[PDB]
Design an enzyme around this catalytic site. Structure first.
Site, PDB file in Angstrom:
ATOM      1  N   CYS A   9      55.143  23.938  20.624  1.00 54.87           N
ATOM      2  CA  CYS A   9      56.260  24.231  20.472  1.00 54.87           C
ATOM      3  C   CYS A   9      56.757  22.817  20.598  1.00 54.87           C
ATOM      4  CB  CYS A   9      57.080  25.337  21.203  1.00 54.87           C
ATOM      5  SG  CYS A   9      58.644  25.411  21.102  1.00 54.87           S
ATOM      6  N   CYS A  17      61.941  28.871  26.023  1.00 53.18           N
ATOM      7  CA  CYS A  17      60.285  28.563  25.679  1.00 53.18           C
ATOM      8  C   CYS A  17      59.570  29.605  26.354  1.00 53.18           C
ATOM      9  CB  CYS A  17      60.011  27.026  25.807  1.00 53.18           C
ATOM     10  SG  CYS A  17      58.686  26.665  24.681  1.00 53.18           S
ATOM     11  N   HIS A  28      62.480  26.713  10.026  1.00 55.91           N
ATOM     12  CA  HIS A  28      63.379  25.958   9.344  1.00 55.91           C
ATOM     13  C   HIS A  28      64.766  25.640  10.035  1.00 55.91           C
ATOM     14  CE1 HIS A  28      60.724  27.322   6.096  1.00 55.91           C
ATOM     15  NE2 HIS A  28      60.943  26.099   5.506  1.00 55.91           N
ATOM     16  N   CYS A  41      58.063  28.060  19.130  1.00 58.79           N
ATOM     17  CA  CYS A  41      57.352  29.128  19.459  1.00 58.79           C
ATOM     18  C   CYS A  41      58.340  30.435  19.227  1.00 58.79           C
ATOM     19  CB  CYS A  41      57.202  29.249  21.143  1.00 58.79           C
ATOM     20  SG  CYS A  41      58.768  29.152  22.059  1.00 58.79           S
ATOM     21  N   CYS A  44      61.952  30.528  21.052  1.00 58.06           N
ATOM     22  CA  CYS A  44      62.636  29.252  20.810  1.00 58.06           C
ATOM     23  C   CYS A  44      63.103  29.293  19.263  1.00 58.06           C
ATOM     24  CB  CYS A  44      61.912  27.701  20.640  1.00 58.06           C
ATOM     25  SG  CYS A  44      61.754  27.146  22.429  1.00 58.06           S
TER      26      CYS A  44
HETATM   27 CA   LIG Z   1      60.150  31.356  29.585  1.00 57.70          CA
HETATM   28 ZN   LIG Z   2      59.495  27.071  22.560  1.00 54.71          ZN
END
Ligand SMILES: [Ca+2]
Ligand SMILES: [Zn+2]
Ligand SMILES: [Ca+2]
Ligand SMILES: [Zn+2]
Lengths: 81, 81
Positions: A9, A17, A28, A41, A44
């Site tokens: 990521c 995250c 995108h 990820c 995120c």
């Molecule tokens: Ca986390």
């Molecule tokens: Zn992440």
């Protein structure tokens, strides 16, 4: 470029995250072009798209776009673009 | 791509922006690649580089990177990339 799957990521919103590259996709930045995208990820990705709003939208955006620049920089180095 | 000269500023930090495309240059986002850059007027360029600090650095960064994405989107449409 949608072969960012399984990469790290590049968005990395703290807390949000998951840090698990198996979940990574080409997310995108908001039929938009794959250049204008970041490796993200699953967590995120949902946050930068505002499906979740764990953090401030300006901060999420900042992280998303920072992630985009890092991703393009990866593409450059790797010969992808 | 350094022929972004005379185009409209894509960073557009309120107040800071001069809005004068004659002053526009390709401002690299921080030998970095020209892809990882935005069209920026002279004022926004100095601010995003932190030669001035009229606004918060997170906000400047956000605007810079937003500008980068808009610029790349311009390059896409115009056949530049
Ligand atoms: Ca986390
Ligand atoms: Zn992440
Ligand atoms: Ca002004
Ligand atoms: Zn400006």
């Amino acid at each position: 470029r949608k072969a960012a799957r399984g990469r790290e990521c590049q968005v990395r919103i703290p807390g949000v995250c998951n840090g698990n590259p198996e979940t990574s996709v080409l997310a995108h930045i908001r039929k938009p072009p794959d250049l204008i995208a970041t490796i993200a990820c699953s967590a995120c990705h949902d946050e930068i798209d505002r499906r979740t709003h764990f953090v401030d939208a300006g901060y999420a955006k900042e992280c998303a776009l920072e992630g985009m620049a890092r991703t393009q920089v990866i593409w450059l180095k790797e010969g992808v673009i």
